[PDB]
A paper describes a structure:
To contribute towards understanding the sequence-structure-function relationships of type II bacterial TSs, we determined the structure of the terpentedienyl diphosphate synthase Tpn2 from Kitasatospora sp. CB02891 by X-ray crystallography and made structure-guided mutants to probe its mechanism. TSs employ carbocation chemistry to convert acyclic prenyl diphosphates into diverse terpene skeletons. Canonical bacterial TSs are categorized into type I or type II depending on how they initiate catalysis.
We experimentally verified Tpn2 as a TPP synthase and determined its structure by X-ray crystallography at a resolution of 2.57 Å. This is only the third structurally determined bacterial type II TS and the first from any organism that produces a clerodane skeleton. As seen in PtmT2 and Rv3377c16,26, Tpn2 adopts the characteristic double α-barrel βγ fold with the active site residing in the interfacial cavity. As is typical for TSs from both eukaryotes and prokaryotes, the active site cavity of Tpn2 is lined with both aromatic (H180, F250, W254, Y329, W384, W483, and Y489) and aliphatic (V116, A117, T177, T181, G244, G287, L291, and G485) residues to form a hydrophobic pocket suitable for binding the long nonpolar tail of the substrate and preventing water or other nucleophiles from prematurely quenching the reaction. At the bottom of the active site pocket lies the catalytically essential Asp-rich motif D294xDD. Docking experiments support that the central Asp, D296, is properly positioned (3.2 Å from C14) for both the protonation of GGPP and the deprotonation of the syn-cleroda-13E-en-4-yl+ intermediate (TPP+). D296 is also suitably positioned (2.8 Å) near H342 for activation. As with PtmT2 and Rv3377c, no bound divalent metal ions can be inferred in the electron density of the crystal structure of Tpn2, leaving the exact binding mechanism of divalent ions in bacterial type II TSs undetermined. Lacking an analogous Asp on the side opposing the DxDD motif, Tpn2 instead has a G485 situated 3.6 Å from C19 of the substrate. Thus, G485D acts as a single-residue switch, exhibiting sole control over the formation of the clerodane TPP or labdane syn-CPP.
Numbering used by the authors: 1 to 79, 84 to 138, 150 to 217, 223 to 509
């Protein structure tokens, strides 16, 4: 009974249930509890919020605590039961402990709409827990932007469909604005159960969607939904590198082909086209004999770099990695450097985003292991072999070798199978090129054998929505690719 057979089994089941599998979040559970009215269900969410709370009374991963901790307490302050106020009391006591310290509150992580989620919850939760005192004011927190959209909504003036993702920031939603909103063909308002909730509180497809979302895990609410293209393209683009001779469902091919359009493809329907998924639809298309067009990708190109979204506040480093990979593959296969200009420029740009320590980060996943391994696949096959590129790649690898742990794995903090599979993946590409360092890259991988075959550990949430989450299908495949690399050394 093979992993190969398993991926093939995963691929058949993916084509059966196109329902996206993102891990629950205390923020999304925290907002859903507050908003889905008449208490269709309340206690199931409460139980889940108390078990996942951290000993220090907070919620979330170390350095991404505010948005989830505010989300949960808002939920447990709305409308108590056993240990709820104890939770609410100890959570709030540990929040003023930080807002009253050195530098005050740590800057907002660049998690989706932190800029809005955080001001909104503190106004609402200010009046809730102004007590438990002897104000917060996060550095990246833009109340101005929050209050602006607030009164744009009340005037019945349309809002960017990007904020439709986080309507739960506008708690009492006026009806004349709710009538502007249409949910997707699956019942979701812009990929978020708690935003859909806000819409509803102010219907068949949408109830079925919320039925499933309050049932999958016993009450805990999936952090986001409706993103079958994202989780399809990332799975398929790892099956195509580490599992050739596993047969891909046609029905999955046609599914991508359905969502791909003039302006490209988004993470899912209800999202606009983005450079990441367009620059991965293309690549998988190529690898499978589909007629693919770089002309569409150039539409996500700006001056010096490809953009996740044409309106780019802060740019994304994996988008440029994912796009260059496609451009390298096309030049190597087609035999012409048609985008010679963009390749080099995108290569320059990728290099200038590396930190002094040797790794990259990304807008979309918060572990440098995702971003570094992606930037490294792109750079090894980058056409020029400029000293900037090989010195870049030389520092990247060095970083990779020096951060391995006694367990054999790697991690932005505690080691994990997702981040270990990223390092071992990035090492394999080095070992299989040769030269100085290449044999230390392989030894490093042989050492990962123990980490993987060892315990069934858990997957920390490293991906960035409005809070962090595991995209389970994508992480399911990543770890097995790491193992396939591992079980070649």
């Amino acid at each position: 009974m093979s992993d190969a057979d398993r991926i093939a089994a995963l691929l058949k089941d993916r084509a059966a249930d196109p329902v996206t599998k993102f891990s629950p979040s205390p923020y999304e559970t925290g907002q859903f509890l507050r908003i889905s009215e008449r208490a269709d269900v309340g206690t199931p969410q409460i139980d889940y919020l108390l078990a996942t709370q951290r000993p220090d009374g907070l919620w979330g991963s170390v350095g991404f605590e505010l948005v989830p901790t505010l989300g949960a307490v808002a939920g447990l302050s709305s409308r108590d039961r056993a240990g709820v106020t104890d939770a609410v009391a100890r959570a709030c006591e540990k929040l003023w402990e930080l807002a009253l310290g050195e530098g005050g509150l740590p800057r907002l992580p660049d998690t989706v709409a932190s800029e809005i989620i955080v001001p909104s919850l503190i106004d609402l939760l200010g009046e809730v827990l102004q007590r438990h005192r002897p104000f917060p004011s996060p550095p990246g927190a833009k109340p101005e932007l929050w209050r602006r959209l607030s009164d744009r909504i009340a005037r019945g003036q349309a809002i960017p469909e990007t904020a439709w993702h986080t309507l739960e920031a506008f708690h009492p939603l006026p009806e004349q604005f709710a009538a502007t909103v249409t949910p997707a063909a699956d019942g979701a308002v812009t990929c978020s159960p708690s935003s859909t909730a806000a819409w509803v509180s102010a219907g068949a497809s949408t109830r079925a969607y919320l039925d499933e979302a309050q049932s999958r895990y016993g009450g805990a609410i999936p952090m986001g939904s409706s993103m079958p293209y994202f989780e399809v393209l990332w799975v398929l683009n790892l099956v195509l590198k580490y599992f050739p001779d596993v047969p891909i469902p046609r029905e999955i091919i046609e599914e991508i082909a359905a969502g791909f359009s003039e302006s490209g493809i988004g993470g899912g329907p209800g999202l606009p086209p983005d450079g990441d998924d367009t620059a991965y639809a293309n690549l998988a298309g190529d690898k499978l004999g589909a007629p693919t067009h770089p002309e569409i990708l150039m539409k996500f190109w700006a001056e010096d770099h490809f953009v996740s979204y044409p309106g780019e506040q802060t740019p994304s480093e994996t988008v440029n990695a994912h796009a260059l990979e496609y451009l390298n593959h096309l030049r190597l296969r087609r035999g012409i450097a048609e985008y010679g200009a963009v390749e080099d420029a995108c290569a320059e740009w990728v290099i200038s985003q590396q930190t002094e320590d040797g790794c990259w980060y990304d807008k979309w996943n918060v572990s440098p292991y995702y971003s570094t391994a992606a930037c490294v696949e792109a750079l090894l096959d980058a056409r020029k072999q400029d000293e900037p590129q090989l010195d870049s790649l030389r520092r990247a690898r060095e970083w990779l070798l020096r951060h391995q742990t006694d367990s054999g794995g790697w991690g932005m903090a505690e080691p994990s199978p997702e981040e270990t599979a990223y390092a071992v993946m990035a090492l394999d590409l080095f070992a299989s090129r040769g030269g100085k360092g290449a044999e230390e890259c392989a030894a490093a991988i042989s050492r990962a054998k123990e980490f993987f075959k060892d315990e069934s550990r858990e997957n920390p949430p490293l991906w960035m929505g409005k809070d962090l989450y595991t995209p389970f299908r994508i992480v399911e495949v990543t770890v097995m690719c790491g193992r396939a690399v591992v079980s070649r050394y």
